[PDB]
Structure formats: C-alpha cells, structure tokens
mmCIF file of C-alpha atoms (C1' of nucleotides) in Angstrom:
data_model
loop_
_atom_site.group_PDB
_atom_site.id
_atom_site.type_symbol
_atom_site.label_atom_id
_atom_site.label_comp_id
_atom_site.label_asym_id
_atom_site.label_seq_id
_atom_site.Cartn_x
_atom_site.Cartn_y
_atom_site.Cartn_z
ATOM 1 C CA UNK A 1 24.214 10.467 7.087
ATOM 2 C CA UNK A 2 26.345 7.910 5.518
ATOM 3 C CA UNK A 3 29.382 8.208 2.934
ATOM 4 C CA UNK A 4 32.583 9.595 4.075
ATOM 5 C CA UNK A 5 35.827 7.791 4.881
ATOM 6 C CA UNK A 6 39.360 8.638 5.437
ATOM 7 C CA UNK A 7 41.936 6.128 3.701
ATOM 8 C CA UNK A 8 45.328 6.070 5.331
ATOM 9 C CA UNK A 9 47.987 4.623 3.940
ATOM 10 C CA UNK A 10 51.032 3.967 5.568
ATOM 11 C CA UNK A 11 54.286 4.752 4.458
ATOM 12 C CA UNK A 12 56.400 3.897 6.826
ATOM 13 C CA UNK A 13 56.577 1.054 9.662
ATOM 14 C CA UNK A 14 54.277 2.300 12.007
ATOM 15 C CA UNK A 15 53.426 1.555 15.855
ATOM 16 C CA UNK A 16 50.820 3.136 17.584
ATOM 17 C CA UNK A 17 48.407 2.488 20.916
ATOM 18 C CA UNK A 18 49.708 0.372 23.506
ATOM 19 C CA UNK A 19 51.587 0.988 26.834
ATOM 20 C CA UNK A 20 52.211 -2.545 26.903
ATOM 21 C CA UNK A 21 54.605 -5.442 25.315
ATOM 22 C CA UNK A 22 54.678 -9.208 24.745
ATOM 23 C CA UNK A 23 57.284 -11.677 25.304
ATOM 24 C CA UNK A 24 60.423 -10.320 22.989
ATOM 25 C CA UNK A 25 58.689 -6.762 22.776
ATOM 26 C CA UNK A 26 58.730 -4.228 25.318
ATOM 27 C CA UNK A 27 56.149 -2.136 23.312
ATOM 28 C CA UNK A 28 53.145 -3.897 21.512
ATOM 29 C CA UNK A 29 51.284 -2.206 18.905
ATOM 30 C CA UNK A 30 47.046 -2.143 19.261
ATOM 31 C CA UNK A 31 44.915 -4.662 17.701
ATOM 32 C CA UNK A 32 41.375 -4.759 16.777
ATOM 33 C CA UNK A 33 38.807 -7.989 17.466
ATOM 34 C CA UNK A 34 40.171 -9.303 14.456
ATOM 35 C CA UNK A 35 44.003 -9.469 16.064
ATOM 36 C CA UNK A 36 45.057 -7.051 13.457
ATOM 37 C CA UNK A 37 46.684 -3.872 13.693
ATOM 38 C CA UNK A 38 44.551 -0.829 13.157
ATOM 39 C CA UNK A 39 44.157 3.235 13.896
ATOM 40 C CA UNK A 40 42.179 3.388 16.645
ATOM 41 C CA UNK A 41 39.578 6.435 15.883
ATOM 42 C CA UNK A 42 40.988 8.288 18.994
ATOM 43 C CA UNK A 43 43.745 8.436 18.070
ATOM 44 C CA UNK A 44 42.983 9.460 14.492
ATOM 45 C CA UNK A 45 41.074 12.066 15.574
ATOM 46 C CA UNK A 46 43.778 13.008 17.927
ATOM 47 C CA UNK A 47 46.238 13.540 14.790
ATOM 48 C CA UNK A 48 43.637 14.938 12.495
ATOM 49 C CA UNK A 49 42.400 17.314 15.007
ATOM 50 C CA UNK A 50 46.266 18.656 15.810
ATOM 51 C CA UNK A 51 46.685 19.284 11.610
ATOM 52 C CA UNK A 52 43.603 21.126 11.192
ATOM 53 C CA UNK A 53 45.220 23.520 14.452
ATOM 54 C CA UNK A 54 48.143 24.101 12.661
ATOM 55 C CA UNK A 55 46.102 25.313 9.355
ATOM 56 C CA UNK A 56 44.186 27.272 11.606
ATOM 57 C CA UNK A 57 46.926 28.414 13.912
ATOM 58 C CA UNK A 58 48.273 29.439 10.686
ATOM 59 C CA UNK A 59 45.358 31.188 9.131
ATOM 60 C CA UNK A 60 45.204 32.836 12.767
ATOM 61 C CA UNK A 61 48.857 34.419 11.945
ATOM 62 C CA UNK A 62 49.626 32.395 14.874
ATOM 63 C CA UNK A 63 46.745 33.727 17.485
ATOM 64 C CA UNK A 64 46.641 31.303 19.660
ATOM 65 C CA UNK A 65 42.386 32.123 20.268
ATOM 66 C CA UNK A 66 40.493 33.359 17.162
ATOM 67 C CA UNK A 67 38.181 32.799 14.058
ATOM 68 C CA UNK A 68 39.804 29.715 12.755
ATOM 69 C CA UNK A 69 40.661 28.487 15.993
ATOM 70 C CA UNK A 70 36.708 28.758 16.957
ATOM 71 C CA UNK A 71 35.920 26.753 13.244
ATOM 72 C CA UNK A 72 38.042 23.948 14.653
ATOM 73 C CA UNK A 73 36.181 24.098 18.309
ATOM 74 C CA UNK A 74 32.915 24.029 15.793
ATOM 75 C CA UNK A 75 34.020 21.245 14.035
ATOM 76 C CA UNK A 76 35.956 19.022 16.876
ATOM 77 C CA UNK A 77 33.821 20.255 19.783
ATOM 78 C CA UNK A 78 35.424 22.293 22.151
ATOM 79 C CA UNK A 79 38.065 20.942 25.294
ATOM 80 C CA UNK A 80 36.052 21.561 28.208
ATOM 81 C CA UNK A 81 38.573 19.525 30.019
ATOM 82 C CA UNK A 82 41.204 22.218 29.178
ATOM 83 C CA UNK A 83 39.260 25.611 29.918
ATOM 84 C CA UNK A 84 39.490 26.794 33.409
ATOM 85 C CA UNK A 85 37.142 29.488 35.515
ATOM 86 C CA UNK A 86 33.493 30.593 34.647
ATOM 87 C CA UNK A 87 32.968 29.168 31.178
ATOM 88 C CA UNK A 88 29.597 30.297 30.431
ATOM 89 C "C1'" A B 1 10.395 10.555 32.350
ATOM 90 C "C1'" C B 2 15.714 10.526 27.516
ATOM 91 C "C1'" U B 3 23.095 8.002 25.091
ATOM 92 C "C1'" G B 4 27.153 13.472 28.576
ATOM 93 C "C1'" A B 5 30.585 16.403 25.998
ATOM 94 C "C1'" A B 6 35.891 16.793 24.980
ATOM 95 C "C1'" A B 7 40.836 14.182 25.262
ATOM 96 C "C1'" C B 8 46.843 11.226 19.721
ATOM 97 C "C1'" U B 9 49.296 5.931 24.617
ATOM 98 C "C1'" G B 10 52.357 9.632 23.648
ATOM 99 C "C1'" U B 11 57.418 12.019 24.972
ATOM 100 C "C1'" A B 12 63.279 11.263 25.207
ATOM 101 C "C1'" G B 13 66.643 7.156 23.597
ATOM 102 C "C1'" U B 14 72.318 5.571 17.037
ATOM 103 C "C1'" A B 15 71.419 -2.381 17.761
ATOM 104 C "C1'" G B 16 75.791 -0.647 19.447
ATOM 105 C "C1'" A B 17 81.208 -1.424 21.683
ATOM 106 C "C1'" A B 18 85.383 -4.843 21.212
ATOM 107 C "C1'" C B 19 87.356 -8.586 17.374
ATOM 108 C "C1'" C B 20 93.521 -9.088 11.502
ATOM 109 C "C1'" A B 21 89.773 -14.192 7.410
ATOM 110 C "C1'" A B 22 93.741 -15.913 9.475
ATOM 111 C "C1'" U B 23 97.581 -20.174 10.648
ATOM 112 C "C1'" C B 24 101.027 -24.451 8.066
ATOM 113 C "C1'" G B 25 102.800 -25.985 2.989
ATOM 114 C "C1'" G B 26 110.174 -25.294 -2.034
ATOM 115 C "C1'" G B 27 105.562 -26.180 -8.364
ATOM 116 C "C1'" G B 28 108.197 -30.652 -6.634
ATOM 117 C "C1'" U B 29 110.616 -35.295 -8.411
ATOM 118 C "C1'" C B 30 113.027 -42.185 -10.470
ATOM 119 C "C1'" G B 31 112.349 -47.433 -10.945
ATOM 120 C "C1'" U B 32 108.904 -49.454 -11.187
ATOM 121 C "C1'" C B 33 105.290 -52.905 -13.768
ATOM 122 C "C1'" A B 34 103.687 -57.732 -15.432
ATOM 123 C "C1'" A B 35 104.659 -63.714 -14.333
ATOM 124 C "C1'" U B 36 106.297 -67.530 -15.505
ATOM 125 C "C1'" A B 37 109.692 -71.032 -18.263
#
RNA sequence: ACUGAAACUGUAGUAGAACCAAUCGGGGUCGUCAAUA
C-alpha cells in the first residue's frame, strides 16, 4: 500500500539529530544525502509514538498498562527492549 | 532452505557582566579694496 504522508511544518527554529558540531557550532543539526536538513523517520516516529501515549495514557485515566495502551503496542509494535522476565 | 522486531540524539543551561555619547568653543566683530597719473 501506497498513499499516506505526514506534512510537518515547522514553526519555530528547529534543531534536531546530531551529537556532533562544526567549526563555530558545538551542536550540528542532521542532514540528508542532499546536505539538507530533514526529520529523520526515527525520530518522527519517536515523537509521534510519545503523542499517541499521552492520548492513550489519557483515555487509560492514566493506567499506565491497559486497552489503549495495548492499541498503541498494536499499532507501534511493542518495546521488547523494555519488558523484563518471561514474556511469553 | 527465507529481510529480526522495538528504540525521539535527547536532557539541564538568560549571549550575558562591566562601560556617562562625551570633551573644547562669548552669536562674535573695522578698514579694507582697486592702480595708476
């Protein structure tokens, strides 16, 4: 499937991406093949992913584990990474 | 003889402290100008 896209406009100065600086800058923003500044999709997910937990963590009345909470696991895949002991 | 999955390069941080747009000056006062006959 084809069709989707998320526009983001920015509406303030942004910086995002990179532990790293050039000459006069201690802290360089990221740049794509084409030199350009862009949102890398990690790091979009990253902030999309953390909204859609606070309308579920809201929808939850603030459960931390729960319906909406397992919606966003369905839709962003779960955090293996996170979860500790015998996950079956 | 089969693509690992999942993961915000982010968190804290006042381009700021110091620095006189300032120093001196009577709104004053006299003989010049031209060259010949």
């Amino acid at each position: 499937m084809r069709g989707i896209e998320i526009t983001i406009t920015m509406q303030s100065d942004w910086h995002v991406g990179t532990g790293m600086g050039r000459g006069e800058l201690d802290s360089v923003v990221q740049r794509d093949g084409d030199n350009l500044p862009y949102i890398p999709g990690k790091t979009l997910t990253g902030i999309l992913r953390d909204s859609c937990e606070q309308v579920a963590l809201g929808l939850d009345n603030g459960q931390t584990r729960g319906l909406w909470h397992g919606w966003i696991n369905f839709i962003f895949g779960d955090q293996p990474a996170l979860a500790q002991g015998a996950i079956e």
